[PDB]
Protein backbone atom coordinates (compact mmCIF):
# COMPACT_ATOMS: atom_id res chain seq x y z
CA UNK A 1 0.00 0.00 0.00
CA UNK A 2 1.96 3.23 -1.27
CA UNK A 3 -0.03 6.12 -0.54
CA UNK A 4 -2.45 6.89 -3.45
CA UNK A 5 -6.19 6.59 -4.64
CA UNK A 6 -7.67 3.30 -5.44
CA UNK A 7 -10.76 2.58 -6.91
CA UNK A 8 -13.55 0.20 -8.25
CA UNK A 9 -15.83 0.07 -9.84
CA UNK A 10 -19.58 -2.59 -10.21
CA UNK A 11 -19.05 -4.52 -13.52
CA UNK A 12 -22.51 -3.58 -14.67
CA UNK A 13 -24.82 -0.34 -14.03
CA UNK A 14 -27.41 -1.05 -11.04
CA UNK A 15 -31.05 -0.24 -10.52
CA UNK A 16 -30.82 3.50 -10.87
CA UNK A 17 -28.07 3.01 -13.58
CA UNK A 18 -25.13 3.24 -11.68
CA UNK A 19 -21.87 1.45 -10.84
CA UNK A 20 -21.34 1.90 -7.11
CA UNK A 21 -17.49 2.45 -6.81
CA UNK A 22 -15.56 2.29 -3.72
CA UNK A 23 -12.57 5.20 -3.69
CA UNK A 24 -9.83 4.47 -1.01
CA UNK A 25 -7.69 7.20 -0.11
CA UNK A 26 -4.38 5.98 1.13
CA UNK A 27 -1.91 8.28 2.50
CA UNK A 28 0.90 7.96 5.00
CA UNK A 29 1.07 3.93 4.12
CA UNK A 30 -2.49 3.77 5.66
CA UNK A 31 -6.20 4.30 5.08
CA UNK A 32 -6.95 8.05 5.90
CA UNK A 33 -10.25 8.47 3.73
CA UNK A 34 -12.60 6.72 1.56
CA UNK A 35 -15.13 8.68 -0.68
CA UNK A 36 -18.64 7.03 -2.08
CA UNK A 37 -18.49 7.57 -5.76
CA UNK A 38 -20.48 6.09 -8.70
CA UNK A 39 -20.57 6.32 -12.39
CA UNK A 40 -23.96 6.63 -14.35
CA UNK A 41 -25.27 5.10 -17.48
CA UNK A 42 -26.80 8.04 -19.41
CA UNK A 43 -24.24 10.56 -18.18
CA UNK A 44 -21.57 9.12 -19.13
CA UNK A 45 -19.38 10.49 -16.17
CA UNK A 46 -18.59 9.73 -12.78
CA UNK A 47 -20.19 10.57 -9.36
CA UNK A 48 -17.43 12.87 -9.34
CA UNK A 49 -17.69 14.64 -12.72
CA UNK A 50 -22.05 14.42 -12.26
CA UNK A 51 -21.45 16.46 -8.77
CA UNK A 52 -19.49 19.34 -9.79
CA UNK A 53 -21.05 19.67 -13.36
CA UNK A 54 -24.55 19.26 -11.65
CA UNK A 55 -26.09 17.11 -14.31
CA UNK A 56 -26.87 14.68 -12.58
CA UNK A 57 -29.28 11.45 -14.23
CA UNK A 58 -30.73 8.64 -12.83
CA UNK A 59 -32.06 6.05 -15.16
CA UNK A 60 -34.76 4.99 -12.56
CA UNK A 61 -36.10 7.95 -10.80
CA UNK A 62 -39.17 6.30 -9.44
CA UNK A 63 -37.41 2.77 -7.74
CA UNK A 64 -34.53 1.79 -4.85
CA UNK A 65 -31.21 3.58 -3.85
CA UNK A 66 -28.74 1.56 -6.07
CA UNK A 67 -26.55 4.04 -5.04
CA UNK A 68 -24.01 5.19 -1.91
CA UNK A 69 -25.51 8.34 -1.25
CA UNK A 70 -25.52 10.36 2.38
CA UNK A 71 -26.43 7.33 4.23
CA UNK A 72 -22.64 6.28 2.93
CA UNK A 73 -21.25 8.64 5.22
CA UNK A 74 -22.14 5.67 7.87
CA UNK A 75 -20.34 3.08 6.16
CA UNK A 76 -16.87 5.34 4.98
CA UNK A 77 -16.42 5.93 8.92
CA UNK A 78 -16.82 2.30 9.99
CA UNK A 79 -14.25 1.85 6.99
CA UNK A 80 -11.82 4.11 8.29
CA UNK A 81 -11.72 2.81 11.73
CA UNK A 82 -11.16 -0.93 10.34
CA UNK A 83 -8.36 -0.40 8.49
CA UNK A 84 -9.93 -3.24 6.61
CA UNK A 85 -11.86 -3.56 3.27
CA UNK A 86 -12.15 -6.97 3.29
CA UNK A 87 -12.92 -7.00 6.96
CA UNK A 88 -16.83 -7.34 7.40
CA UNK A 89 -19.97 -9.67 8.46
CA UNK A 90 -23.38 -9.67 6.91
CA UNK A 91 -26.49 -11.27 8.20
CA UNK A 92 -29.02 -10.83 5.35
CA UNK A 93 -29.87 -12.37 1.68
CA UNK A 94 -28.12 -9.25 0.53
CA UNK A 95 -25.34 -7.68 2.54
CA UNK A 96 -26.88 -5.98 5.32
CA UNK A 97 -24.97 -5.13 8.31
CA UNK A 98 -25.99 -4.88 12.26
CA UNK A 99 -21.85 -3.39 13.10
CA UNK A 100 -22.46 -0.28 11.13
CA UNK A 101 -25.61 1.02 12.57
CA UNK A 102 -27.08 3.91 10.53
CA UNK A 103 -27.10 2.67 6.90
CA UNK A 104 -30.12 0.35 6.37
CA UNK A 105 -28.87 0.02 2.87
CA UNK A 106 -27.20 -3.11 1.77
CA UNK A 107 -22.91 -2.77 2.00
CA UNK A 108 -22.17 -5.90 0.62
CA UNK A 109 -21.00 -3.60 -2.46
CA UNK A 110 -18.94 -1.26 -0.29
CA UNK A 111 -16.80 -4.09 1.13
CA UNK A 112 -16.34 -5.72 -2.51
CA UNK A 113 -15.24 -2.88 -4.26
CA UNK A 114 -12.93 -2.10 -1.61
CA UNK A 115 -10.91 -4.92 -2.09
CA UNK A 116 -11.38 -4.71 -6.19
CA UNK A 117 -9.98 -1.03 -5.28
CA UNK A 118 -6.46 -2.17 -3.56
CA UNK A 119 -5.85 -5.42 -5.35
CA UNK A 120 -2.79 -4.14 -7.27
CA UNK A 121 -2.06 -1.69 -4.22
CA UNK A 122 -0.98 0.69 -6.80
CA UNK A 123 -3.72 2.10 -8.62
CA UNK A 124 -3.86 5.63 -9.16
CA UNK A 125 -7.48 7.23 -9.97
CA UNK A 126 -8.31 11.09 -9.02
CA UNK A 127 -6.99 11.74 -5.57
CA UNK A 128 -10.04 13.10 -3.39
CA UNK A 129 -9.30 15.48 0.01
CA UNK A 130 -11.71 13.75 1.77
CA UNK A 131 -11.70 14.18 5.71
Same mark, same amino acid.
Given at each position: ? %???? @? @?? =?????????? %??? /??? =? /???? %??????? +????????????????????????????????????????? @???????????? @?? *? +? *?????????????????? *???????? *????????????
Amino acid at each position: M %KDGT @Y @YA =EADDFDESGW %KDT /VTI =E /VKNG %KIVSVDW +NAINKDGGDDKDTLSRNGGYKMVEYGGAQAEWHEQAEKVEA @YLVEKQDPTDIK @YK *D +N *DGHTDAISGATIKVKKFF *DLAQKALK *DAEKLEHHHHHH
